[PDB]
Design a protein around this ligand. Structure first.
Ligand SMILES: Nc1ncnc2c1ncn2[C@@H]1O[C@H](COP(=O)(O)OP(=O)(O)O)[C@@H](O)[C@H]1O
Ligand SMILES: Nc1ncnc2c1ncn2[C@@H]1O[C@H](COP(=O)(O)OP(=O)(O)O)[C@@H](O)[C@H]1O
Ligand SMILES: [Mg+2]
Ligand SMILES: [Mg+2]
Ligand SMILES: [N+]
Ligand SMILES: [N+]
Lengths: 234, 239
């Protein structure tokens, strides 16, 4: 059992992680209202509409009626209406779904942000090791399968003490191994700490953040932020 | 009679202008909640808390009990609570108010944005000329009075046909006179068109935008945006 993106992100926020939960809408009219209200706070901003379905590969998927993409850029609230209207009540087809696609009943409306770096981060129980493991790569753009066979220096695997959880030294090293400097190191530490707490305290089978991003705020500060989230349970 | 910033900005938006209306809160608890919810959309953004009072010079004002500023930057939702708690139910003292200040009953919570340029733009009925006039300077940071005597080249005054309203050629020239190029020229034209419609169709005696800004969106697009707004009306006007 997997939970939806927005639910996973809200759970991450509850444990102190930074994640763009946006706001969910169950109608295209409501989606447009969310975007219009957000223009009162950041005039001229763009939007991203994210189909909330239990499946990956949304961005490169397609809809029966012709729309391309399950994660779509929109420049206006009316474009948010148009995009959400093709998602809600319709089926999205991705490589992780059969040709049957999967039904979508709601979308996430997000502000469009500048993404500087994309990381992959997952937390799971590694049966071989017999302990929790934090897996991460500094090349979140490309799949994790390929990364381990086209640039293994960028993939990192961190065994975790089950009883003591991650140590500060482990997380600091992981942040620097991913290429982070300055304030971003401790920012990353805090976020991975929160991601592990979600994993441990929620009895999760997997916490996968793809991508864990370095984004710019509207005033150009660099911060760590979960831009996607998949949390699984048995 | 002047109306509050929140109302002026929403009125400008109704007529197609770009203005940061933010969201109004009547308690510090609500102010915090607005900021926290906004972090779901632009994580890590900063905030600006703006006292809604009928007086200018808020940014440079002070509160009796020690806080400095009526327009204040806040880095977190809890700082928004702290700042708003010192505004709501308290009196702000500015250059335009008396010594005792003026009561503040609500604040605007706004997202912090990068401001590239600040312009002054006003639309009013010039009695001497006997027609509406659009006044603007490319130096909105300094007072319009300072501009007229230390850089008059930056102040522009455009008489408007009362019957036909501003022409596209006047507005294009004004945008270029203010130093704009590229997409910002037409962006400025559209926004000033909207401001004049507010002035004309709402029977206003003054629409003052100080500053009319060039701001960056979160994805670094440059757009025109009203960052302050003062609209006046005359209850005892000539019929
Ligand atoms: N708010 C956003 N602004 C800009 N780009 C975004 C935003 N959120 C996500 N993206 C981009 O969209 C891509 C697809 O989104 P994602 O949530 O990962 O869905 P999926 O992995 O199912 O395709 C991300 O890899 C990221 O590059
Ligand atoms: N959202 C914002 N982000 C950053 N700075 C802002 C924002 N809105 C306004 N400002 C700045 O705050 C200053 C003071 O606010 P303003 O609305 O002009 O009030 P007042 O003129 O009464 O001081 C503005 O001139 C502008 O420089
Ligand atoms: Mg993803
Ligand atoms: Mg002002
Ligand atoms: N940015
Ligand atoms: N910016």
């Amino acid at each position: 059992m997997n939970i939806h993106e927005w639910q996973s992100k809200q759970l991450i926020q509850k444990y102190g992680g930074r994640a763009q939960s946006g706001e969910v809408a169950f109608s295209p009219e409501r989606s447009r209202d969310i975007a219009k209200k957000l223009w009162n706070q950041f005039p001229g901003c763009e939007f991203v509409v994210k189909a909330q379905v239990l499946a990956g590969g949304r961005g490169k998927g397609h809809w029966e009626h012709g729309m391309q993409g399950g994660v779509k850029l929109a420049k206006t609230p009316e474009e948010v209406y148009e995009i959400a209207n093709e998602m809600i009540g319709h089926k999205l087809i991705t490589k992780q779904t059969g040709a049957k696609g999967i039904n979508c009943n709601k979308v996430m409306v997000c502000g469009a942000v500048d993404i500087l770096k994309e990381f992959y981060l997952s937390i799971l129980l590694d049966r071989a090791m017999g302990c929790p493991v934090i897996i991460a790569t500094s090349q979140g753009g490309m799949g994790i399968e390929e990364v381990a066979q086209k640039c293994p220096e960028c993939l990192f695997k961190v065994p975790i003490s089950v009883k003591n959880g991650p140590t500060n030294e482990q997380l600091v090293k992981l942040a620097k191994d991913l290429g982070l400097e300055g304030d971003l190191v401790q920012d990353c530490v805090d976020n991975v700490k929160a991601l592990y707490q979600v994993f441990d305290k929620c009895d999760s089978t997997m916490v996968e953040i793809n991508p864990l991003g370095v984004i710019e705020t509207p005033t150009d500060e660099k911060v760590i932020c979960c831009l996607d989230a998949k949390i699984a349970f048995d």
